[PDB]
Design a protein around this ligand. Structure first.
Ligand SMILES: Nc1nc2c(ncn2[C@@H]2O[C@H](COP(=O)(O)OP(=O)(O)O)[C@@H](O)[C@H]2O)c(=O)[nH]1
Ligand SMILES: [Mg+2]
Length: 160
């Protein structure tokens, strides 16, 4: 019965869309229009509780204001995208007017061998933020459920 508005943010090309589509449609899209910004709905069950997810895949001022949780996505083979995380976080903090916003740090493209962002680096950032860090591959589906479900768990602990 509960609904959760989730927002997926991060630099262009990190796999925001691919991640969202795997969760929604259960397949990996190789070439999804980089400019398309849209929301996707799905009824899920998480730790036994039924819930409707409304997920904005950015590429809206509305979702920022009404978003209850955010995935901060970088790709592990894109140092610049990891360096952009702080900016995304501060922007959310500003709009939401809080310092306790539910967020999850997501390191995507974990199947790729060209790693330039150490796991240690990401974990150290997430620790400073007090948020979970989850490694994912939209391509193999590794960690996809875990990223979204973890965010939902962070939302629930926050409003409780
Ligand atoms: N190898 C690999 N490629 C990915 C992964 N996620 C996304 N991609 C590719 O990276 C490119 C951009 O992905 P996209 O989802 O559009 O990124 P977005 O701009 O953040 O929405 C596309 O070529 C995707 O196929 C992943 O986990 N592994
Ligand atoms: Mg996209």
């Amino acid at each position: 019965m509960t609904e959760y508005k989730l927002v997926v943010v991060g630099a262009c090309g990190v796999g925001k869309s691919a991640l969202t589509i795997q969760l929604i449609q259960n397949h990996f899209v190789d070439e999804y229009d980089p400019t398309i910004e849209d929301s996707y709905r799905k009824q899920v069950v998480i730790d036994g509780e039924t819930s409707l997810l409304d997920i904005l895949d950015t590429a809206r001022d509305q979702y920022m204001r009404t978003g209850e949780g955010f995935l901060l996505v970088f790709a592990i083979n894109n140092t610049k995208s990891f360096e952009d995380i702080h900016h995304y976080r501060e922007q959310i903090k500003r709009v939401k007017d809080s310092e306790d916003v539910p967020m999850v740090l997501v390191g995507n493209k974990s199947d790729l061998p060209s790693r330039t962002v150490d796991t240690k680096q990401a974990q150290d950032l997430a620790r400073s933020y007090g948020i979970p860090f989850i490694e994912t591959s939209a391509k193999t589906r590794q960690g996809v459920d875990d990223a979204f479900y973890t965010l939902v768990r962070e939302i629930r602990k926050h409003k409780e």
